[model samples]
Target chain A: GELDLPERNLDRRELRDLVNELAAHPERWAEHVMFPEEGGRHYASLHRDAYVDVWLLCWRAEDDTGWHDHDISSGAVRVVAGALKECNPRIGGEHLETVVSEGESFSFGPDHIHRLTGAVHGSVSIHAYSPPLWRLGQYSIDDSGVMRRVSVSY
Target chain B: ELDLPERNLDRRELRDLVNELAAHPERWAEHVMFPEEGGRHYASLHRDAYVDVWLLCWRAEDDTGWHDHDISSGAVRVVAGALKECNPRIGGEHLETVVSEGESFSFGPDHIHRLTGAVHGSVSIHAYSPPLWRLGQYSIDDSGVMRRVSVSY
Candidate 1:
């Protein structure tokens, strides 16, 4: 590799491009993807260098990740095998939903909040997070309809 | 994006990293890595913070001569194609050939080797720690003398 990268953190474009590269190289991790018959979701780290970390995530049908945010890291995800649906709560209405399929990708920053669920029989995706991932914030609605933020440690 | 890289990587680790990220459709994406008319084509995959990754495509007849990486430790993995690797044997008097396909290999800094396209079409993923900038190509001069010609990447 003869490319020049600055010392600063990578932007959304760079992160998205990196995820695309990982998606294209699924042969390296296809065998590692496992759809657990009794688990929520399956994930494994693909790479971790100084600046970035890559992960492979597999979703069982009907599986979902509730509203969550990546704390301070920027992330890019590309669906590789099946389909995933993302639900973003709008300012004051129904959630905005997008179905990410094979070859489709999406990006998010630290402040972004969304819930991701499997939209097909099963799905696989590649995710890249800059500066690596630490703890994340999971969201829920209290009985009073007030939003609650719960910090989750990985 | 604000977190620091955990550690410095070596050649074998870099290769293992690339081998884990098997190819996807974007590999043939326009401007990524298209085969050139007479040589291998390389496109930058990632270069930010502490690691560098690249994608390469090869058509029949493409060859990279014996060369040494200046200061960067490197790893290469064939993704979609096959290739022949030639490295100087222990004696430095002859080259040993290895057919590499769906397999990865690593070389330390200053290691000399050559690669040639061996199948109808091929694809490869490569990673380098500290990145590659300077190189040296080994060749036999007209005077029957061996020389290391300085090159750049």
Candidate 2:
């Protein structure tokens, strides 16, 4: 086996389709579900091709990815086991919150900003990112009442 | 998810795809399951009109009887443990190849072979082009007549 990356990047819809395909085939990933012992989350890169990369994430109770956005990659997430809470914040409008239960999925474009947290009992999910997520933007509000973003590479 | 169109990938492309999948254990390693009854088990990984992929788990004593892909070509990568592939001959001894972990092999539509687990708890990934619609099962009759039966997937 050797490293063979895909030559082109996939679109958001394609990435969503990819994760949904993987989520449907539980026999291909269910055995790999492992929750962290010390809390937080455990993640692994499942597959990578020319267009996108797939990942598996196991979340423990209280685990969360704070407000953030994929720098240049569109992505999709499928909740395979348990549930997850997604929050979309607006500058001056009412924030939107949604519960993604087992077997449910959601997708977003590169500029879509949101936060995801593990539900009360924790959860397992599959994610696919186009062009492979290299950098991301984490958002937070400073003391001066201004929003700030810190770019980080994963 | 949308209904993606088929790519009609060739044998080489299928081989590369399976090898690529094998290289990433995070995709399937934790999903490998060996049957407690000491036999072979398998799961479909991906499938479309032109290509299909599968994860196969093998235990000692498990064997795939002699068979041939009727019109498709295939590639196999042994991710864990090993396998013994045997090509039968009419007037000579069967030829055997031992494929160990991390090794791969490919065959054309007309190639016929038998496969057996070389060690316990063997795991492998396989890809087929044109989606393995039908196969030829082979056997030699008591009267020394070779027989081939076509079976559809």
Candidate 3:
């Protein structure tokens, strides 16, 4: 079979479907969903190191995350099987809360910083992004000048 | 709205999504949840050519004929929807049953020749190989010596 892999303009739906074809793979997600050990933190693997990173994430349990953002990389998550709790912060407002369930997904830019956790009992998911997640922003907010720094990895 | 020229729409899910998009709500099964116009369809995109994923659907009364992978791997799951079974062939062991409900999923190489159908009055779901499903096999087993042929744009 010959392939005409051209750099053509694609619609969101078209990109979404094509991306779905790439993301929803059994071999790719196998390691991400069923981990080698039980009760472990979110695990990830990058298939091809191109403009972004292709990763499979396996996570569970009630865990509050350190405020973080993938450095130089945009992020999008597709729930393989489970739910995730998201906490968003504003300059001077209450934290925003969101629940991403199975089959539901969302994306964020490199500048975006948020906290994530596996609030559910059992949840597995997949994540992909542009430029790959190399550096991440770990943050802490309080009254006197919030402290935010970059971590080498997420 | 910024619009670029229409793409080839040759990618598996892209073609089907285009079709369902053209079919509108009518082209899609009424039972499944999807984006009516655009962003409604919650999608996940990937950069790999062989590992893309999708959970789009086929409405009731819709069906896909006998096809083979021609050297590829494919998988399908109901996710929130479901599909029917027209798994019949010209042989002694003919299975003309139906997949009524639940998350019915299937996966194998391109050599598997079977017909699939959407659940009656419901919907069907799928995941494909090559990240972009460009070709599939449809076997015509008339004479015992089986020959596999694949066709897709």
Candidate 4:
């Protein structure tokens, strides 16, 4: 008989565990880590299934994901090498910043909005999204000083 | 979501699965890591009740020794480098074969063999049906008899 597939999407905890397990074994992903020559970042899909998608990303010094929220997918990330700076918008136009160093991990729900950038020396990370990211909401500040969001398929 | 019960995969199915996974370097290439010394290292890639997949790195002089699966059959795909599989024979030399990159091999639950890394080292993917829970390690005793030790993991 054929193996049965997952019936539903994984939860945030499962996503965190998946990324953490991959991050714990650098030997498995170190060879694929390559910094970008100029702008932007390099990424590769590590695995994908009906319920989830896993990716490996290599970030350059100036690489930033900008502010965005997953449309309906919960996700998690683990720093495999170097460090990453994560920023989350807070109440009253304030923003909270956290530095996730190598071996560290973090998770977020579908409603969470945040952005990530490479630290001074660049970074490598493993990201997992449940229900596999299909659309993303990108955030920006309008000329009139109001926040705007644009939904884009990814 | 709940996963289904274990479904035992046949040798052919396992071989094809490993080869399919190997064909997509983007899926597992990032996880390949070679040992610094003459040995082997492995990490679990995915696991469910029915099957389990692993990525293994082999270096020169490394050998699995003579071993047999307790109940699970397995398939192996050599993604990079090469390996030699040896089957023992009584009163004669063992039967040996080299498995190279892009090639794969499979064994039944009752098979016993030893795998050794080639001179240049290798990386491979392994899949086990019904998910391996125990292994039988074999060795030759001083009295010229083969002994088997059951190990659970």
Best by lDDT: 4
Lowest lDDT block of 10, candidate 4 chain A: A142-151
Clashing pairs in 2: A6-A49, A6-A50
Candidate 2 whole-model C-alpha lDDT, 0 to 1: 0.74
Error of 4 at A45 (Å): 0.6
Q: What CAPRI grade goes to candidate 2? A: incorrect
Question: What would the per-residue lDDT of candidate 1 be over residues A1-154, giving only the tens digit for each residue?
Answer: 2123445567667888988876776577777888888766888888776667778898888788887666556889999889999887553435678888988998875446678989987688988887677656565554434333455666
Measured as a fraction from 0 to 1, the native contacts recovered by model 1 come to 0.00
Candidate 2 iRMSD in angstroms: 32.6
What shift in Å separates residue B24 of candidate 3 from its native position after superposition? Answer: 73
Clash number by candidate, in order: 10, 2, 24, 2
Query: Which digits, one per residue and each the tens of the lDDT, describe model 4 over residues A78-150?
Result: 9888999998764334466899999899997655667898895667889989888876666565443433345
- The 10 consecutive residues of candidate 3 chain B with the worst lDDT sum are B1-10
lDDT of 1 by residue, B84-134 (tens): 877653223444555566788887664667887467567777777776755
Candidate 3 ranges with C-alpha deviation above 4 Å: A1-19, A36-42, A141-145, B1-153
Q: State in Å the error of residue A129, model 1.
A: 0.9
Q: DockQ (C-alpha) of model 3?
A: 0.01
Error of 1 at A11 (Å): 1.6
Candidate 2 local lDDT, B1-153, one digit each (tens)? 113246766777777877888988777776688767665788877777887788898888888897767557899999889999987643335667899998898876656678985688888998887788766565544534333455677
